[PDB]
Nucleic acid binder design. Structure first.
Ligand SMILES: [Ca+2]
Length: 312
DNA sequence: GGTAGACCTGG
DNA sequence: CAGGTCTAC
């Protein structure tokens, strides 16, 4: 009973809650949607993963978000630990208000988003986010999730073990920048991405100023932030936009891939004006990204998540 | 200065 | 061929 992953019903006394109706957050819509790849629904409707360097299990009901953390001597989440969960889901950002704004300026959203409330962006760590998305090249959520999982098992610090699952924190810069890491990563199937992880871990640490550099980008402007990241090997416009949108607090960033194009040509009859190329291209993509930022406003990136979900 | 191609591996 | 990046035309 005191073993394995917990459930709200099995170990009641060890849970705490955060007021949050499903209209504000839908775990099943956000945790496996491809923002973070470290959450698993071990028990139905129960998600487990590493948040703030500790293992948590989250599950929601009516107007509550239930949290339980595995640090000894158990005990429900504390006032502050639960606060970390709040910052992670950026709950202070009200979706009810955003859906209202986007819906009032975009009829197609109005309809489409009705059946998909509770979609929002996670406030991730710049490192985990930088390296996870460097691995998303020529890949899908399932592939990426696997790679990222073996990567932490191999170089991340061992947290705690639940059932036959051992949790690891995301690798540090020192670890990814170490000797022979690229070779190690290739054995884990990362392919050519192995080079970028390693090259990028070294660049931040030996050419840019380390962790601080990355972090400091949360205070910089979207344009500065975007430019900075692109400096890294394996980090282009797309990955830079994801990192900006997902870890550096830039809600206006709008990552453009052939997917966003499909949603644009099918639900808006969008077409490139400036750039000549009709298919995706550096210039046409930038243009497409500007279209949505003009259409949805500052949180264009959050609106995109909503559509991607409903398009599933 | 904008556009094919290789880089790993597997569904 | 794939939710990308890098580089030689
Ligand atoms: Ca780059």
């Amino acid at each position: 009973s005191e073993f394995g992953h917990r459930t709200l019903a099995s170990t009641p006394a060890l849970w705490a809650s955060i007021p949050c109706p499903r209209s504000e957050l839908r775990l099943d819509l956000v945790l496996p949607s491809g923002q973070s790849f470290r959450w698993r629904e071990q028990s139905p409707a129960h998600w487990s993963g590493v948040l703030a360097d500790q293992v948590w299990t989250l599950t929601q009901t009516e107007e509550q978000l239930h949290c339980t953390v595995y640090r000894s001597q158990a005990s429900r989440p504390t006032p502050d630990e639960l606060e970390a969960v709040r910052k992670y889901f950026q709950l202070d950002v009200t979706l009810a208000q955003l859906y209202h704004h986007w819906g009032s300026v975009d009829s197609h959203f109005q309809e489409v988003a009705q059946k998909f409330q509770g979609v929002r962006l996670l406030r991730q760590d710049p490192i985990e986010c930088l390296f996870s998305f460097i691995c998303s090249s020529c890949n899908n959520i399932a592939r990426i999730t696997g790679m990222v999982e073996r990567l932490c098992q191999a170089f991340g610090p061992r947290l705690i073990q639940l059932d036959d699952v051992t949790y690891h924190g995301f690798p540090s810069l020192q670890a990814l920048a170490g000797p022979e890491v690229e070779a190690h990563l290739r054995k884990l199937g990362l392919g050519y991405r192995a080079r970028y992880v390693s090259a990028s871990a070294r660049a931040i640490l030996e050419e840019q100023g380390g962790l601080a550099w990355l972090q400091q980008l949360r205070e910089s402007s979207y344009e500065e932030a975007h430019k900075a990241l692109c400096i890294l090997p394996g980090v282009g416009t797309k990955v830079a936009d994801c990192i900006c949108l997902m870890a550096l607090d830039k809600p206006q960033a709008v990552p453009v891939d052939v997917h966003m194009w499909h949603i644009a040509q099918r639900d808006y009859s969008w077409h490139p004006t400036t750039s000549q190329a009709k298919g995706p291209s550096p210039q046409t993509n930038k243009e497409l990204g500007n279209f949505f930022r003009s259409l949805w406003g500052p949180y264009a990136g959050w609106a995109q998540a909503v559509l991607f979900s409903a398009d599933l």
